[PDB]
Design an enzyme around this catalytic site. Sequence first.
Site, PDB file in Angstrom:
ATOM      1  N   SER A   1      26.188  12.777  -7.129  1.00 14.90           N
ATOM      2  CA  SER A   1      26.871  11.912  -8.088  1.00 14.90           C
ATOM      3  C   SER A   1      25.930  10.969  -8.836  1.00 14.90           C
ATOM      4  O   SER A   1      26.403  10.217  -9.694  1.00 14.90           O
ATOM      5  CB  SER A   1      27.961  11.152  -7.442  1.00 14.90           C
ATOM      6  OG  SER A   1      29.062  11.959  -7.094  1.00 14.90           O
TER       7      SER A   1
ATOM      8  N   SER B   1      32.904   7.553  -8.272  1.00  8.66           N
ATOM      9  CA  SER B   1      32.259   8.889  -8.308  1.00  8.66           C
ATOM     10  C   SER B   1      33.310   9.963  -8.582  1.00  8.66           C
ATOM     11  O   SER B   1      33.291  11.012  -7.943  1.00  8.66           O
ATOM     12  CB  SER B   1      31.511   9.206  -7.035  1.00  8.66           C
ATOM     13  OG  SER B   1      30.637   8.157  -6.693  1.00  8.66           O
TER      14      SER B   1
ATOM     15  N   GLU C   1      31.204  19.493 -11.238  1.00 11.18           N
ATOM     16  CA  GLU C   1      31.783  19.108  -9.930  1.00 11.18           C
ATOM     17  C   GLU C   1      32.774  20.171  -9.516  1.00 11.18           C
ATOM     18  O   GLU C   1      33.608  20.592 -10.319  1.00 11.18           O
ATOM     19  CB  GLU C   1      32.484  17.757 -10.073  1.00 11.18           C
ATOM     20  CG  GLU C   1      31.485  16.630 -10.040  1.00 11.18           C
ATOM     21  CD  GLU C   1      31.057  16.232  -8.632  1.00 11.18           C
ATOM     22  OE1 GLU C   1      31.381  16.989  -7.658  1.00 11.18           O
ATOM     23  OE2 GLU C   1      30.401  15.162  -8.498  1.00 11.18           O
TER      24      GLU C   1
END
Length: 266
Positions: free
Chosen positions: A43, A101, A141
């Site tokens: 992150s 995050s 992600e």
Amino acid sequence: GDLADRFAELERRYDARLGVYVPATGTTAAIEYRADERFAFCSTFKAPLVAAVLHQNPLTHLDKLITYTSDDIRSISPVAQQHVQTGMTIGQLCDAAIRYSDGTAANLLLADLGGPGGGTAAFTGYLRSLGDTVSRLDAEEPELNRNPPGDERDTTTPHAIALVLQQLVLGNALPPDKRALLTDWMARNTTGAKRIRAGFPADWKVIDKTGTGDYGRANDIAVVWSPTGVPYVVAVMSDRAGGGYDAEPREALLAEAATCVAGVLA
């Protein structure tokens, strides 16, 4: 005494690999330990990601409403998963990407930067624009957290990320209005309370962005200000890849590395 030997001791004691970079200043020597070795971003990329979005757009873009569905939640998204019905502005996404995050916020910001297929390449190019010829983002992600050790995808080095953060927060990569927004989001992030913040005395200001991922990956990138207002950039990266993909990340390693940095900067 030898600071590198103490970082090696920390590696032995935690069964970990540690990377540190604190850029040299007019008053201080660099600290460098495995600084040119690759570590996964995890992150930590979300700080420069927000910088990229700020750089590329007028500040009015912060008010642009981004809409998405529950099918867009594909990673840990503490904020975005509660706003599927409202959407989130770009500014809200920046906030969530840095302070929580938020993986969906980060994927939406990547898409804002590069389009659906170009966000990771756009992000990489932003880092190329700051002089970083080593770092690369390849996945969104959550897969960017998950590459095996030795895979160069989704990696930086402590040296490269420290010098990016130096340019973003202390240097002139961003105009001072945009810089102030990035600094304020990082300053209001509590995710790293047990990382670099924990190794600096309470009279030092610490702003940071953490990263955590597979193979025991725990990172933190910070800017710190002494009690007399002297700033430093501190990048600490770690992994425990010897333990396998489910090796526990260790926040305390980063706190202790930070304590050793604070001992030489105090």
